[PDB]
A paper describes a structure:
Although mice do not encode Gal10 in their genome, they do form pseudo-CLCs, made from the chitinase-like proteins [name] and/or Ym2, encoded by [name] and Chil4 and made by myeloid and epithelial cells respectively. [name] (encoded by the [name] gene) and Ym2 (encoded by the Chil4 gene) are CLPs belonging to the glycoside hydrolase family 18 (GH18) and are unique to mice, with no known human orthologues. However, [name] is mainly expressed by macrophages, neutrophils and a subset of circulating pro-repair monocytes, while Ym2 is produced by lung epithelial cells, which could have discrete context dependent benefits. [name] and Ym2 are among the most strongly induced proteins in the airways of mice after allergen exposure and both proteins readily form pseudo-CLCs in vivo.
In parallel, we produced recombinant [name] and Ym2 protein in FreeStyle 293 F cells. Spontaneous crystallization was aided by low pH and low temperature (4 °C). We produced recombinant [name] crystals which were shown to have identical crystal packing and structure by X-ray crystallography as in vivo native crystals derived from murine lung. Native in vivo isolated [name] crystals and recombinant [name] crystals as well as native in vivo isolated Ym2 crystals and recombinant Ym2 crystals were crystallographically equivalent, sharing the same monoclinic space group (P21) and unit-cell parameters. Thus, recombinant [name] and Ym2 protein crystals can be generated in vitro and are biosimilar to native [name] and Ym2 crystals. (C–E) Structural superposition of the X-ray structures determined from a native in vivo grown [name] crystal isolated from the BAL fluid of mev/mev mice (C+E) (yellow), a native in vivo grown Ym2 crystal isolated from the BAL fluid of a C57BL/6J-Tg(CAG-Gal10)Bla mouse (D+E) (blue) and a recombinant [name] (C) and Ym2 (D) crystal (grey). The low root-mean-square deviations (RMSDs) establish structural similarity. When administered to the airways of mice, crystalline but not soluble [name] stimulated innate and adaptive immunity and acted as a type 2 immune adjuvant for eosinophilic inflammation via triggering of dendritic cells (DCs). Thus, the induction of allergic type 2 inflammation was specifically related to the crystalline state of [name].
Numbering used by the authors: 1 to 373
The structure:
């Protein structure tokens, strides 16, 4: 099994006790470290900031401590959106400029591969033709990496992509059989399944549907999402299940109605460290519980939730990570990806469950072993 771990460039900019630097990642904790995010300029991959280069040296220097460790560079993300990718895949010339820039950039900065994180081909403004063009990009990039490997006699660069977790988005953006042929891994985005627009409390990443979920809401869970990817042709061993190290918050309409599917008014207030309305890092949820929130385990979805007054949070803990790890081995999946590693309790000071409680749970239950460690 693989245990991939995202490190976000903006984590070091948080208040000092909640900030995390790439050089402080345990080199033996994960099998792959993914740096989010690279930028794009003139159809070429580039760094978003000059300090990112210092982060690349620190992150890639962890490979001297674990010689089996692989590093990937992610490009895209939700805030980046689809427009730069739509323009880049539009012509063979633009795709070639991008592919050659990727090879030079990854080799220069000692990355082992690329994580395409287009959100998304075929939606958010990206036209229907991008479902085909993204597949053409992936196949051409895979071919170029194979040629580069043969010509330079070095191990081939890895090629991965995120895969949407929302069924409708999957249908309009992904040629699953073709992508599974050319990609080494697909990081399935089995998170942000809280459906904030519907007006009810929902879990960020439930393993199974709630007995009250109806229609498309009954597909907002790990089991349904991964089953859709496999039923439509993705290689089980190439699927990397997304494990969020955070939860989503809500303001309850009635502090007496605190279950899953309870009426809500809005997103909850931002946490002190992550500063994003509707989100709390796992370490911030630990503070929420420590200061008095009522913790509930939801067995039908196999995830926890917590509330205090009118604030409600749906999240993942050690038990939900353990149950999902057992489910992923039972389903013959390729492994897991922690999103983002910087929201797990990296210091051990917020949760009192040692360093990286969520990620360490996966390291143990997925039998992660490196001869270098």
């Amino acid at each position: 099994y693989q245990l991939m771990c995202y490190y976000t460039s903006w984590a070091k900019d948080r208040p000092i006790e909640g900030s995390f630097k790439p050089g402080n990642i345990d080199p033996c904790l994960c099998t792959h470290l993914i740096y989010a995010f690279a930028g794009m300029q003139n159809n070429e991959i580039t760094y978003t900031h000059e300090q990112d280069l210092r982060d690349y040296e620190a992150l890639n220097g962890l490979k001297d401590k674990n010689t089996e460790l692989k590093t990937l560079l992610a490009i895209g993300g939700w805030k980046f959106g689809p427009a730069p990718f739509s323009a880049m895949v539009s012509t063979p010339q633009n795709r070639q400029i991008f592919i050659q820039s990727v090879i030079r950039f990854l080799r220069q900065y000692n990355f082992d591969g690329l994580n395409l994180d287009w959100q998304y081909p075929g939606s958010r403004g990206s036209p229907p033709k991008d479902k085909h063009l993204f597949s053409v990009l992936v196949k051409e990039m895979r071919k170029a990496f194979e040629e580069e490997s043969v010509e330079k006699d070095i191990p081939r660069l890895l090629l991965t992509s995120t895969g949407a977790g929302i069924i409708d988005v999957i249908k309009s953006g992904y040629k699953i059989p073709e992508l599974s042929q050319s990609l080494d891994y697909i990081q399935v985005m089995t998170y942000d399944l809280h459906d904030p627009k519907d007006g009810y409390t929902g879990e960020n990443s439930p393993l199974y549907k709630s007995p009250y979920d109806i229609g498309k809401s009954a597909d907002l869970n790990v089991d349904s999402i991964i089953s859709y990817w496999k039923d439509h042709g993705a290689a089980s061993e190439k699927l990397i299940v997304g494990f969020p190290a955070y939860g989503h918050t809500f303001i309850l309409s009635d502090p007496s109605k605190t279950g899953i599917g309870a009426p809500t008014i809005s997103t909850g207030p931002p946490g002190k460290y992550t500063d994003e309305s509707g989100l709390l890092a796992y370490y911030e949820v630990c503070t929420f519980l420590n200061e008095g929130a009522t913790e509930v385990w939801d067995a039908p979805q196999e995830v926890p939730y917590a509330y205090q007054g009118n604030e409600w949070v749906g999240y993942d803990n050690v038990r939900s990570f353990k149950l999902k790890a057992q489910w992923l081995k039972d389903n013959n999946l390729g492994g897991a990806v922690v999103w983002p590693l910087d929201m797990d309790d990296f210091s051990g000071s917020f949760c009192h469950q040692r360093h990286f409680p969520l990620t360490s749970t996966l390291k143990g239950d997925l039998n992660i072993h490196s001869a270098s460690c």
